[PDB]
């Protein structure tokens, strides 16, 4: 049921059967979030979830892609993801295409670019932690002037490690389980900011919510603004958008996921017909 980083949501038949849907985890979550979607897909559609691994987006896809090929060989490949999972799906599609594999569907569930690029600068690191520090005041009581000089030369992992170490040495002992949920959620979402998105030659459906929910905007304000194409237009010539309304956070759940599943079911149906 769990094999390394692959979760079986519905096992494919022993031989033959329908084309599997590969789904990819969101930041801070498992691919159990795709069970509602599975319920809205055709009967006996296999689904395998790719769970968290370490590295940049590119390094994560470098681990996923060999496993995908082990499982599905030449294709067809159907790759689907919400949130971070959308970025991982796309990154895998890129890698699979470089290897000559047949990617037939990429389904992005409101995986939408920030309205402006996240600067990778010392100034931005300073500004970000000042914002977070001010919020943390209202939470677990005056933070001492952030030691920016150490902070600004660290990656996202080291930033969080430095801050967690400051908290620890200041007296507050956080349960490891809370540290882990918060830490991975934070870092896995931040990994997106420096994703090296390449142009893709195949079909992508973007299921487009109306807006990012407030917590995402508090995490990163530049998510307050989004473009109609979610930033994908310049990368994807064959881009279809399915408007689904609502907020990013709700896109993965009933009732909105019914709209995603209904559309994606037709795409899967066409793929299955074509295989004759
Ligand atoms: C850097 O280069 C590029 C080039 C092109 C791109 O797309 C065309 C993108 C790109 C793509 C997709 C996304 C993206 C972000 N997210 C989820 C974000 C989130 C979700 C929940 C939360 C939360 O609530 N908390 C509490 C942390 C906080 C943040 N999904 N897709 C971002 N950038 C990036």
Numbering used by the authors: 1451 to 1591, 1593 to 1727
Task: Paste lines from the article.
Pks13 is a multidomain enzyme that performs the final step in the synthesis of mycolic acids through the condensation of a long-chain fatty acid (C24–C26) and a very long-chain fatty acid (C56).12 The product is transferred from Pks13 to trehalose by the Pks13-TE domain. Pks13-TE is a validated target for the development of antibiotics for Mtb. In previous work, we identified TAM16, a potent lead molecule for Pks13-TE. X-ray crystallography verified that compounds from all three different series were binding deep within the active site of Pks13-TE, displacing the side chain of Arg1563 with atoms within about 4 Å from the catalytic Ser1533 OG.
Pks13-TE was preincubated with X20404 (series 1) prior to crystallization. Crystals were in the same P21212 space group as previously reported for the TAM16 complex. The crystals diffracted to a resolution of 2.1 Å. Unlike TAM16, which inhibits by blocking the entrance to the catalytic center of Pks13-TE, X20404 binds closely to the catalytic serine (C23 of the X20404 is 3.25 Å from Ser1533 OG) and engages more extensively with the enzyme in a hydrophobic channel that likely binds the alkyl chain of the mycolic acid. This channel passes through the central core of the enzyme, extending from one solvent-accessible side of Pks13-TE to the other. The channel occupied by X20404 was not completely visible in the Pks13-TE-TAM16 structure because the side chain of Arg1563 blocked it. To accommodate the R2 group of X20404 required the displacement of the Arg1563 side chain, and an entire segment of the protein from Thr1645 to Gln1649 is also shifted by approximately 2.4 Å (as measured at CA of Thr1645) to open the channel compared to the TAM16 bound structure, as shown in Figure 3C. Four hydrogen bonds contribute to the binding energy through the following interactions: O29 of R1 with NE2 of His1664; N16 of pyridine of R1 interacts with water connected to the backbone NH of Ala1564 and, through one more water, to the NE of the Arg1563 side chain. The Phe1670s side chain, which flips to stack with the benzofuran core of TAM16, is positioned to form edge-on pi stacking interactions with the R2 phenyl of X20404.
